């Protein structure tokens, strides 16, 4: 019981030799501002990945 208790997918094609999946993230903040304001904070993002065979 190995295919019965774990999911089976179909993404890969016969000729493929490897695969890869990625993750992501973000950072940021906010503040209390006034009428004539030129000072505003910013945000960004990241990401990684892994492999198989």
């Amino acid at each position: 019981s190995a295919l019965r208790v774990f999911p089976v997918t179909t993404e890969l094609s016969p000729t493929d030799k490897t695969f890869e999946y990625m993750t992501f993230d973000k950072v940021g903040t906010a503040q209390i501002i006034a009428d004539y304001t030129d000072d505003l904070p910013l945000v960004d993002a990241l990401g990684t990945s892994e492999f198989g065979k």
Binding site: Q31, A34, D35, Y36, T37, D38, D39
Partner: protein, 52 residues
């Protein structure tokens, strides 16, 4: 009969605490008045800047 009359008045130039020209300028609008009141046409001081 009578002679009509016409007058002229010039407006003032500026008011206290008013931006004069459209040159390079920068307002910081993320500040808090810690204590007391602040007049419009006067300088200020920075007691403390928060870290987070």
């Amino acid at each position: 009969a009578q002679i009509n009359a016409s007058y002229q008045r010039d407006m003032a130039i500026a008011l206290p605490g008013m931006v004069a020209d459209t040159s390079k300028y920068n307002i910081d609008g993320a500040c808090v008045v810690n204590e007391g009141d602040v007049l419009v046409g006067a300088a200020v001081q920075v007691v403390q800047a928060q870290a987070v």
